[PDB]
């Protein structure tokens, strides 16, 4: 239609800027990264945003609300993703044997 | 901290079906997920392989967790060479 073609345009053309993530990663490493790191790390974070919004619209469709996304559907989105191990936290030393 | 992903993330939520005008407190949440996702995939990437940040260990975490992040990183590494072959 005429909205699906505009939505497909924003699904492809949108990206995080490489001039800021290279500034963001290098504040964590200390020295330097490469261009093929920033190209991949800018691409995984678009999949991760698409992992949340496609699942936060499943929370909103499950409850009785409309397309505008309140934060109620966004804290619930991170809760359901973390219970399936999708959201990694490297500060919780987990233990499976008890 | 200011918001470094305020205008970029509004295009992306529209790209996955949200609205043309998302709420400010919803982009407040998604901007903090991405900064933690890049932090909790760099803090764990500087212990694997070596104490640097080569991209041969960024591709390790994407398998056995979610195959969409792996099938969309093999496309960005293949298309880097088909966009330098055209020049």
């Amino acid at each position: 239609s005429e909205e699906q073609l505009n939505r497909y345009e924003m699904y492809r053309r949108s990206a995080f800027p490489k001039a800021a993530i290279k500034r963001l990663i290098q504040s964590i490493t200390g020295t330097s990264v490469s261009q093929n790191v920033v190209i991949a790390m800018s691409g995984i974070s678009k999949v991760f945003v698409g992992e949340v919004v496609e699942e936060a619209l499943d929370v909103c469709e499950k409850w009785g609300e409309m397309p505008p996304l309140q934060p109620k559907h966004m804290r619930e989105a991170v809760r359901r993703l973390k219970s399936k191990g999708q959201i990694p936290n490297s500060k919780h030393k987990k233990i499976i044997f008890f | 901290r200011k918001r470094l992903f305020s205008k970029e993330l509004r295009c992306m939520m529209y790209g996955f079906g949200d609205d043309q005008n998302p709420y400010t407190e919803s982009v407040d949440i998604l901007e903090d997920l991405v900064i933690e996702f890049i932090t909790e995939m760099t803090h764990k990437a500087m212990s694997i392989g070596r104490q640097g940040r080569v991209q041969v260990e960024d591709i390790v975490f994407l398998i056995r967790k979610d195959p969409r992040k792996f099938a969309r990183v093999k496309d960005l590494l293949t298309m880097n060479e088909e966009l330098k072959r055209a020049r």
């Binding site: 505009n6 924003m10 053309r13 949108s14 505008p68 309140q70 934060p71 | 205008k7 970029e8 509004r10 295009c11 529209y14 043309q20 005008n21 998302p22 709420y23 400010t24 407190e25 919803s26």
Partner: peptide, 26 residues
Amino acid sequence: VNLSEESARILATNSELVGTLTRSCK
């Protein structure tokens, strides 16, 4: 020179269509 000016035109239309009014929520 063609790659330098056309890169910012994919993002310039990404500030005219999406996000016209800024909302909030209780």
